[PDB]
């Protein structure tokens, strides 16, 4: 239903609110919710965990069936598999490792997968483990996304950092 509540209004397609990404999977029912993935899509920490545990491990039994299948994702590639009870699909996205040296310029491939969906419930990419620099990822989101993005930061201090940084 994509009913999308309490967001602030960056620009005319980008939104943000801290907020978990589970709980308001299960408010809005959207379409589409995107996962911060890796590679082998072994959903154990961050985002994915958080996903994948409120799909009671649905979402893991099934991307073990797709990397049986298909192999592994690259760095800034996707996949839209089920979205099991939180969405109707869920775009893995993965997003560069810059902890591990991976090339930060496939920050920008990543966000570019949003463009294939009208509307996507999202966390911040690259963020968590992976070390990139949150002002400057929502700063591509914001460069190169087209379509309706509503980000969910599940961080006080760090959704009032960006906003701040955003509004200079
Ligand atoms: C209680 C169950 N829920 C959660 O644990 C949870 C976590 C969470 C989240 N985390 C962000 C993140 C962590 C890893 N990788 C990222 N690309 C982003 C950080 C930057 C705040 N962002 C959004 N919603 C979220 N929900």
Known sequence: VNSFSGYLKLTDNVYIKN?????????????????????????????????????????????????????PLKV????????????????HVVG?????????????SAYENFNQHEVLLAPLLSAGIFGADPIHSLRVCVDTVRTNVY???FDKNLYDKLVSSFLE
């Not at 911060?36 to 073990?64: F, I, P, R, W």
């Not at 800034?76 to 775009?91: D, I, R, T, Y």
């Not at 560069?96 to 920008?108: A, S, W």
């Open 19 to 71: 907020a978990d990404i589970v709980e308001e999977a299960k408010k809005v029912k959207p379409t589409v919710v995107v996962n911060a993935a890796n590679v082998y899509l072994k959903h154990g920490g961050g985002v994915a965990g958080a996903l994948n545990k409120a799909t009671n491990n649905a979402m893991q039994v099934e991307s073990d069936d797709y990397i049986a299948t298909n192999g």
């Open 76 to 91: 800034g590639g996707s996949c839209v598999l089920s979205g099991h009870n939180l969405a109707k699909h869920c775009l």
């Open 96 to 108: 560069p490792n810059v902890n591990k040296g991976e090339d930060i310029q496939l920050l920008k």
């Open 151 to 153: 980000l969910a930061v």
